[PDB]
Amino acid sequence: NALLRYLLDKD
Amino acid sequence: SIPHLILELLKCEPDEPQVQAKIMAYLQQEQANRSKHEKLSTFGLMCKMADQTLFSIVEWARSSIFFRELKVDDQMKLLQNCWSELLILDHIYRQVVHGKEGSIFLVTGQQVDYSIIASQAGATLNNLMSHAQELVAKLRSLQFDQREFVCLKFLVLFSLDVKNLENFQLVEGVQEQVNAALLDYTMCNYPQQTEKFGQLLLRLPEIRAISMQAEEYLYYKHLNGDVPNLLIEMLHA
Ligand SMILES: C=C(c1ccccc1)[C@@]12CC[C@H](O)[C@@H]1CC(CCCCCC)=C2c1ccccc1
Predict the structure, then answer these.
(1) Ligand 1 within 6 A of CB of B182
(2) Cα pseudo-dihedral B44, B53, B197, B129, rounded to 10
(3) Domains in chain B, start-ordered, CATH in brackets?
(4) Does the N-terminal or the C-terminal CB of chain A have fewer CB atoms within 10 Å?
(5) How far is A9 from chain B (nearest CA, A)?
(6) Residues pairing with B27 in the sheet
């Protein structure tokens, strides 16, 4: 689930 | 008095006007872009409404006490386990606070008559919404308040049902300490309602049942071609 990881990692 | 832990939880709540305004505006533009013949089915609008609510839920969690200490892989496992529960819990509390008989209050700030929704939603969603309304009525009779709501949010998020965690001990500790804080808070602030703490906890299995059944129905609708994003990613994972 790349989208959820991105939402948790993004600045 | 308020346990300090609950005060820390309250500190993490989103600015709800801003969350609802942003979602309302997103959906307005979406419909505006769409031509006369390609408007969204009401089910489709609700899907996008839920999708955008999920973005705000993820943003809330990642900034919250305790959750922000987890490695990202643990954060993902928690949210994948409870995302639908949080959507339903948020829906329920919105009706508790703003709900009037015969209508549903949406995350956009719109009030909609139940007779309109029930005409379009179909038997399964009507059943799940009606069961959710039974929880609303029960929680309003118990005087469910915001301190208890944020406790239940954290008890949903930090679920013992989640396996394969790197730091299962933090999840167990939060579950235990929020429980003790809720138990204390209800006792101090609602001394006459002996049943309140238990009636709150017993909503969590019911919300879990409603939300998991909701997930299975939405996965069906996706497989059937009825769904347009984050909502789909959460369903699959
Ligand atoms: C999980 C939902 C959902 C998702 C996709 C499609 C339809 C519903 C919600 C939960 C809150 C959201 O705003 C959604 C709005 C809604 C209430 C009114 C819309 C009905 C469909 C025309 C949800 C909901 C609330 C309680 C029980 C089940 C679903």
Answers:
(1) no
(2) -10
(3) 1-237 (1.10.565.10)
(4) C
(5) 8
(6) none
